[PDB]
Amino acid sequence: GYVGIKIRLTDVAPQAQELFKKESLDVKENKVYLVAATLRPETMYGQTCCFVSPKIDYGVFDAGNGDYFITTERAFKNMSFQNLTPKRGYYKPLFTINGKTLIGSRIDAPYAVNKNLRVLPMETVLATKGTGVVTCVPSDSPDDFVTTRDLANKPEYYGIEKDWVQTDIVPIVHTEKYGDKCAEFLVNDLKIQSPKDSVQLANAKELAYKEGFYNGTMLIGKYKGDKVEDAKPKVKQDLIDEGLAFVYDE
């Protein structure tokens, strides 16, 4: 399965404000989270934004105890069958919301060293996979790097502001094969120039996974200096113990 990462919504975009007001959902008084699905919890130190898709209608769900989750309905339904929600098999949202409506919102992401994070559009999110929410780590995810490059090179065109997208990458994982920002290395080496180059991106993804997990060393956090292979379960358990993440299966 995946690790779900609880990314706190701190201020909603203007186009969303009316909607949240109507449903008496105040993001400063209730705990409203975008829940991103990841397989690399050890890289959370390097989140530079959170991605949603313009093509997806998300639900805002009651997750109990004053928490609310923003995910696909598919994902929340699965969560209800493994004790992560207030009632087994119950998955009606309070309301639905299209990804475009959330663009520009402000967020706080667990363990991120960068501050002032925003919600940004990713056109290539697979609707049927995970939660439909993907957190952005350009140092080590080739998809994230390439999408970040396109947004930063033409922000006005994509309907975003340039200050929303961060291009100064702080290194998180050291490898001998690809240096300290393996996604940058691989995107250049394989000459990947578009987010829709799917077959090449999958090749880059797997090369990055292998080298990083088995041969990489942490450059940051409590486990700085440890091998990623040893540090990764510890980071995951730390996040879970602190209420910042959970596991779920599909």
Binding site for ligand ANZ (CB under 6 A): 37-40, 43, 125-126, 129-130, 132, 134-135, 137, 140-141
Please report, as a single letter, which amino acid is at residue 117.
Answer: L
CB of 211 to ligand ANZ, least distance (A): 11
According to DSSP, the residues that pair with 98 across neighbouring strands are 57
| Residue with nearest beta carbon to ligand ANZ | 140
**Nearest CB to ligand ANZ, comparing residues 99 and 104:** 99
Alpha-carbon torsion angle 128, 130, 131, 132, nearest 10? -50
Q: How far apart are CA 250 and CA 248, in angstroms?
A: 7
CA distance 170 to 213: 18
**CB 3 → ligand ANZ: shortest distance, Å?**
9
Task: Give backbone dihedrals phi and psi of 119, rounded to 5 degrees, phi first.
Answer: -85, 125
Q: Which is nearer to ligand ANZ, 134 or 165 (CB)?
A: 134
Largest CA distance in the chain: 53
CB of 25 or CB of 219, closer to ligand ANZ: 219
Nearer to ligand ANZ, 17 or 96 (CB): 96
Q: Which is nearer to ligand ANZ, 27 or 109 (CB)?
A: 109
C-alpha distances in Å from residue 210, one per residue of 3, 110, 142, 188, 231 = 19, 24, 13, 18, 15
CA 172 remoteness from chain centre: 16
Q: At what angle do helices 142-153 and 182-189 cross, to 10 degrees?
A: 80
Torsion angles phi and psi, residue 113, rounded to 5: -70, -40
Smallest gap from residue 205 Cβ to ligand ANZ (A):
6
Least distance in angstroms from the C-beta of 184 to ligand ANZ: 12
Phi, psi of 246 (to 5 degrees): -145, 165
| Min separation Cβ 46 and ligand ANZ, Å | 8
Q: How far is the CB of 62 from ligand ANZ (least distance, A)?
A: 23
Q: Which is nearer to ligand ANZ, 19 or 190 (CB)?
A: 190
Return the number of the residue (158 or 209) whose C-beta is nearest ligand ANZ.
209
Rounded distance between C-alpha atoms, residue 243 and residue 222, angstroms: 17
Least distance from ligand ANZ to the Cβ atom of residue 15, Å? 23
